[PDB]
Design a protein around this ligand. Sequence first.
Ligand SMILES: CC(C)(COP(=O)(O)OP(=O)(O)OC[C@H]1O[C@@H](n2cnc3c(N)ncnc32)[C@H](O)[C@@H]1OP(=O)(O)O)[C@@H](O)C(=O)NCCC(=O)NCCS
Ligand SMILES: CC(C)(COP(=O)(O)OP(=O)(O)OC[C@H]1O[C@@H](n2cnc3c(N)ncnc32)[C@H](O)[C@@H]1OP(=O)(O)O)[C@@H](O)C(=O)NCCC(=O)NCCS
Lengths: 161, 162
Amino acid sequence: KFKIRPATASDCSDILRLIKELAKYEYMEDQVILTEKDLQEDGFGEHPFYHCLVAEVPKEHWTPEGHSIVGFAMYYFTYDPWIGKLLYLEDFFVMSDYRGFGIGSEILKNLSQVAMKCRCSSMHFLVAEWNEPSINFYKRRGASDLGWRLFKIDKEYLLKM
Amino acid sequence: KFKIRPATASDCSDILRLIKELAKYEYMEDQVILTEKDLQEDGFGEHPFYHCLVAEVPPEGHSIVGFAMYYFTYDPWIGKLLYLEDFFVMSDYRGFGIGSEILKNLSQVAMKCRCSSMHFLVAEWNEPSINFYKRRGASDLSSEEGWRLFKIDKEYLLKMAA
Ligand SMILES: CC(C)(COP(=O)(O)OP(=O)(O)OC[C@H]1O[C@@H](n2cnc3c(N)ncnc32)[C@H](O)[C@@H]1OP(=O)(O)O)[C@@H](O)C(=O)NCCC(=O)NCCS
Ligand SMILES: CC(C)(COP(=O)(O)OP(=O)(O)OC[C@H]1O[C@@H](n2cnc3c(N)ncnc32)[C@H](O)[C@@H]1OP(=O)(O)O)[C@@H](O)C(=O)NCCC(=O)NCCS
């Protein structure tokens, strides 16, 4: 079977690896420039910038490379001025050979519990328009659609201001 | 003529007021269901779910004429980000530099926390803002292109929870 649990500092290597795997699955692996050190400093200090749940499997089923972590979800809390606290699901991925065993479902169950405990009114998340399989996975679980134009201002300009 | 400072719990009354006005400006004042109590708790409890900067000058008797609501987010590919959720300056007070000064403070916040970028939202139905930002280096992050924002409301969450 498997166990869903909060991430720990020692899971960052596995988390980074799964992040690159999902990005690759999204045809943009080259974009991942975050490192293990970043994940540790940003997720395991006094004030985390994100939170992760990971799926650990028994030794008999570790990956060929010898990895015990085969899935994860990264999230953090956001705020809507009209409704209040929201749980934001940032990244969600399960290794190919481990999909279809109920890991992603259990992860969503834990996420929902985190949401209710922190009294979030809803959970929001993005999905590549072409990623139909996942889309239907989410939809079958209450997922619904929700537009504007996302802009950004890099540190290059922020520093200026 | 004005000062930009962090908000305190006693400014929540003004915050809601400005939230309502911005929502009214977006033609959706009815949509705001958040209460002043909620804001103080969510914003000044043991865990702040957001941060707020307010503009204060020396109408209905209020000295707070503008604000910006933000919080930190994380991008798995680039790291820490500053997320600007709400930004507003009462009409009579626009055009003097308040908004620009607020962005200035937000920028300092982003540099202090070492955020690699500040994300927010701009409406296409308004060229002014688009350029009001573009002139500030605000690159059009069409990165959103190819993504479908989704939501799972409390109902479906409680279902998965229990
Ligand atoms: C989407 C994803 C995270 C879901 O995780 P998962 O581990 O495969 O999920 P589950 O195994 O719990 O559910 C997958 C399916 O197997 C079926 N399943 C699992 N265990 C089962 C069992 N014992 N008996 C019958 N069916 C079973 C489920 O019913 C489900 O399909 P459904 O949508 O009709 O309910 C995973 O497929 C993946 O990593 N894909 C890419 C991730 C992605 O696109 N990113 C999200 C955007 S951030
Ligand atoms: C967008 C908003 C917050 C900007 O704040 P603001 O106070 O009006 O902005 P500014 O103070 O920079 O005034 C704008 C203009 O006044 C002029 N200005 C500023 N300071 C000045 C000064 N000291 N002397 C002369 N002109 C001045 C500028 O030309 C400037 O625009 P530019 O820099 O692009 O050329 C405000 O217009 C508003 O509340 N709009 C609706 C909110 C909205 O669209 N946001 C929703 C997204 S969450």
